[PDB]
Write a protein that binds this ligand. Structure first.
Ligand SMILES: CCCCCCCCCO[C@@H]1O[C@H](CO)[C@@H](O)[C@H](O)[C@H]1O
Ligand SMILES: CCCCCCCCCO[C@@H]1O[C@H](CO)[C@@H](O)[C@H](O)[C@H]1O
Ligand SMILES: CCCCCCCCCO[C@@H]1O[C@H](CO)[C@@H](O)[C@H](O)[C@H]1O
Ligand SMILES: CCCCCCCCCO[C@@H]1O[C@H](CO)[C@@H](O)[C@H](O)[C@H]1O
Ligand SMILES: CCCCCCCCCO[C@@H]1O[C@H](CO)[C@@H](O)[C@H](O)[C@H]1O
Ligand SMILES: [Ba+2]
Ligand SMILES: [Zn+2]
Lengths: 310, 310, 310, 310, 309
């Protein structure tokens, strides 16, 4: 028969979410409760009912007693797992109580940037049993798992936390236990608002003010430089994300500003071409269309993305 | 009955405060005094009264003697704790004297940037007992804890240091001991003064000098470029802080310079529109308002933030 | 006679491909099946048929029993290999079942950037036996090796995976076993399209629009600044790659835009020289060649690279 | 009575001096000579007179023999100390000869940037005895300590090296031994000359050449842009240093160039105001003061800092 | 003294960091050392070669009261990440040791005076802690050198050498030192494509505009060119340490500053002539201004080439 292994995982801290590398880093406590009757002991009156062991004088004790421990792996772990505590408390009964306090980076392969910066992402930790379900079965330790109240994350906001059990077939033919701690998080848009939206809108709005000067060459010079600024913002955005094979909402927004700016250059080239061919009165009458085209083009673009993405 | 565990923590160095990641790094010495009568030993005349042990031939000795040690965790620790010394001195009495010399990063979740750069922050180290208060009780080792006199921090300045004891319920149902070393620090404004305030004020002041040239087009070109400079300073500031979900005093200050610059472009567009419509004498008379508006707008903005934040 | 050592390697994650350092990083599981009759054991009825050991109480057991283990090296490994699990399961038969779960960077010396960004690269992991083929022979463990289905890589896309066995002569005179896990990957061009192709083409296209203004000095100023922008893009590209001794397709493309821009400056200098020497009507008639030269030069350049590289 | 512990420290390499973090990194060899009569041994003819031990089979031997070793700490150490060698040679007499070869970062709290880049700094390594002077007394091992002849540092130049012994009271009530290896280093100014002084002087000198063009508007545009360049150099300098609470010689120099540039804008605004009010002949006569003011202002500024700092 | 056979092979050059003057390699260290005291008797059927993990082998040496040839990688920096540390002990007492590692090593031989046309010396120093009366290092033949898949793209190894010398680090008397040395030169393609071609383009296309005959436009052009060169000056400085000496590249950039400064100065003079009603004079002299520019840069190029070669 298989022995129940009680898994508990609690994330105390979110040391950071690195979206360029699609991983996240946490400070967490792993807790296991496992009754092995073979590990039970007799104690004399006055002698302790609970034996405290350092993993691995405990592992050395299991090898001596020829006992198999529920060897597990953090399936989505990355790099070094820095440990704080690896402590065992063994009761008279044979109940092993294990605590693993660590700092570690975990793969975040659920990353979908299609609606960035208005995106919601799934983050998880996979705890897998190396041995199959006929030997060990993972159970949910109640009263433990979840996320703490001082995570330290400022950009992200955790919407919900879940825990569940599933099978995996990594090293075995037969099903093996897998404990899952999942959490969903959405973004605080303040950074994007203050650094990208407000500046891009300002550049567009104050550039439109200069249309009231009625100098077509000055408009052309202005839209030309604006195009370079947007190319620069394009690089600012691209630095936050991986080199994706798909278009983001932000990417569409920037390509949109390129297209409109390109057309602003094209249109004011036409009006100045009229002035150059002795048709200044015509260009001055059409100028109302040039002045009102600019806000309509950006308002048409904004409605196009909002439709294409929502 | 529970055994008193005497906790002492001393920060020798502040290797740095990383406000983007909301953590801090220290070189510290942890000192513990714990009397365990079971660890007492008899010595022969001439033989040593104090046994010196490396943790973990000492831990190996505790496991042998079936003794439980006051297992603790640095609750707000992050990543690897690099140790320099982990030494035990055991007296005939059974008094364990432990010294833990380490370098470590700790979570700084008390970070409030709302008044940045005029902010004061709380930094702490949490030392928690894994075992509850019925087994072990943390006591304040007197004559030890605090901060050193060569911390090596140049930007921050420590205003006060405190030590206190409280309960926690991390791994247990019942209350467990927690030692706290807390310190408050404020910022040296010289960097912000020299690199952000003086340059932003200079750009504004020398830009106003050119109003005395009486060229409205030149003013428009100047305010336009100034707006781009402020957008660049906006990115310079944002690089120092996390991607916060809230507005800082600095953020308000930069948004303020955007608004005024936007209006300077708008106003000088109007004056130049008057000149273009054969009303140069009118624009020249109103020019006194345009020239005196600029300093009043920035002085009105400065009083608005100072009221909105103080 | 030689003993068959069954090698299995599975890449769970591609933590990243760093093309500037020509290496890649993976999370992988190494699996070995090796029957050593000398390690066989007798067990009593009811006692376990499978002994579970931590490498290296298992290594300590081999040294005791004076047995030589199939010592191996990851030949193309770089830096620290962070281990998650190093576990042995020893059957009554003497069948050692070893699992090595690790995170590691590996040298990528197969990097050929000549057709970048339209390049396809070879990535491999070399597992070598330290002892020669007369002692140990590597065999392909079936049902294991390959790449997982949640690699987490966004820019690269794996085209095919292969496993094979070959000889090496690293530390021995005679041939020694080598297990090879190879994979080919091509690039998602979306990043290059959105950040380099679209911006470079936009700068060129909107710059051509201004030719319709018929101001030769303005064209010269525009081409001059465009040349500086391309020099800046040249640095943006160079930051992605190592300091190669050869020319890439991208390098040819940028040098191409330099040459054409240099000639645009040269040509419009000539047309403006005609206007300056009272030959404005001649320069205006030739202007059709100057306006249609620009698109033909870039279209001629594009066909030259496409021929020179394909 | 107390036992003499002979301390020797030799820095082989300066892997770098990081002035932003106020620390330095070295590759060093620590050498200790300590006679413990209790460790003396009898050897049979033919058997070795010197026993070679790995620290810590040697430490395991001390714990067995119930002997206390002169436990020490590198007081100003930071982070991980990567060890190369930790070897003991024990003579028949009981003379322990210890060698500790390591790479480590050390706190540099003596950093005074007030005269940067013409500054001279103190760098030290503190080796402290954990046990007081009644048990162990540190002595200077002669013929060892100092700095090597291939340190590998290119910017800094070591002026002098010193070694001395003092007391500390870190973990004890009574005085405890402290070994000090101190060195003074000054900076090679070539980087600052080539990248900051020559460029800033060039910008100022070639900008003055254009005064001979007699275009006041062109001067205003030039001084305005020069001010932006100095603001950029201001950021270039600030990146090298910590966010100090005090003004450096460099900071004064940059603030100086801001003030003069601000005044150049102010003065040429006045001359152009004269020209605009039909007083061109007056502005042309005064122009000699404007042309000779510029070099006098920068020469007056240079004498002010040189007095204020020397 | 007992002969200790040292062999060192660099499999990979993980990188050369010229700003920190160090280099990083993946290497295999191989030692052959006969200690008769370690010899063993084996029964028929029992193994003739005992395989040990360093340090059950070191634990065996301490037991047998034997001194091992303790060594240090003298020019090593930071952590040496090990892959393999394996011993094979023959019946004879021949210890066969293999040390597979990744490590950074100090490169103190760095001479940037002719950068980017420089050739540098890189080495690894393996020192015996014990003197030559106890242990003597010998060259293990058939092993040492550099591999054929080093993975370095900018540098090209010109030659590899191995030799033995003495050191006096921890002892009064001479102690053995094994040296693996290699010389490497640079692939100039990066400098050509990113620094030479752009700087020459800026200079050449800027000269084209002289044919416009607008002295103010030339002044504005040379002024901005000076700022571009100041920016390239920072681009170059980022690759190297904060040296106390001038490089060929530094001289080249200072050269472009001087010529650009003079271009501003000269066209200020020509425009001063035009402003003082002497346009026909400035137009005749303009041939000297137009032909001065290429001569100044060609004179500068010959000055550096002489001063450095
Ligand atoms: C740029 C946003 C602010 C617009 C307000 C109008 C005043 C002019 C601001 O300077 C402009 O900056 C562009 C970007 O570099 C240049 O291309 C352009 O020639 C220049 O006139
Ligand atoms: C900019 C602060 C200094 C102001 C002093 C007046 C002289 C002109 C300085 O150059 C100006 O720089 C702006 C920013 O890029 C450009 O938009 C603008 O067109 C340009 O004239
Ligand atoms: C630059 C791509 C957009 C071209 C559209 C035409 C309008 C002008 C845009 O500003 C231009 O930017 C160049 C780059 O800095 C300068 O050299 C040039 O003098 C300036 O006029
Ligand atoms: C700038 C140092 C070189 C001065 C030599 C005179 C020629 C003009 C160089 O270009 C100038 O660059 C400034 C900085 O951006 C701009 O503000 C200014 O309007 C522009 O004319
Ligand atoms: C700059 C190399 C290309 C030269 C070709 C001539 C066309 C003009 C290119 O723009 C120029 O860029 C300089 C650098 O910022 C400015 O100083 C200058 O005023 C501006 O006109
Ligand atoms: Ba401009
Ligand atoms: Zn006593």
């Amino acid at each position: 028969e298989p022995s129940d292994v009680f898994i508990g995982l609690k994330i105390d801290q979110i040391t950071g979410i690195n979206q360029k590398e699609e991983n996240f880093s946490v400070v967490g406590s792993l807790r296991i409760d496992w009754r092995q009757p073979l590990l039970a002991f007799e104690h004399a009156p006055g002698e302790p009912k609970h034996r405290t062991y350092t993993l691995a004088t405990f592992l050395k004790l299991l090898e001596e007693k020829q006992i198999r421990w529920p060897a597990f792996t953090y399936h989505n772990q990355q790099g070094r797992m820095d440990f704080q505590n690896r402590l065992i408390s063994l009761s008279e009964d044979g109940t092993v109580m294990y605590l693993e306090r660590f700092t570690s980076t975990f793969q975040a392969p659920a990353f979908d940037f299609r609606l960035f910066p208005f995106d919601n992402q799934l983050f998880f930790i996979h705890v897998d049993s190396i041995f199959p379900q006929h030997l060990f079965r993972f159970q949910e330790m109640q009263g433990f798992s979840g996320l703490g109240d001082q995570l330290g994350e400022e950009e992200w906001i955790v919407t919900e936390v879940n825990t569940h059990l599933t099978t995996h077939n990594e090293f075995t033919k037969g099903d093996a236990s897998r404990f899952v701690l999942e959490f969903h998080a959405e973004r605080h848009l303040n950074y994007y608002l203050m650094r990208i939206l407000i500046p891009v809108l300002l550049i567009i709005t104050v550039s439109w003010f200069t249309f009231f000067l009625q100098d077509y060459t000055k408009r052309i010079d202005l839209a030309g430089g604006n195009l370079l600024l947007f190319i620069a913002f394009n690089f600012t955005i691209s630095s936050d994300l991986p080199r994706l094979g798909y278009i983001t909402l932000m990417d569409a927004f920037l390509v949109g500003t390129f297209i409109i700016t390109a057309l602003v250059v094209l249109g004011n080239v036409w009006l100045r071409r009229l002035e150059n061919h002795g048709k200044q009165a015509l260009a001055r009458k059409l100028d109302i269309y040039a002045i009102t085209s600019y806000p309509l083009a950006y308002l048409l673009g904004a409605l196009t993305l909002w439709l294409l993405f929502f």
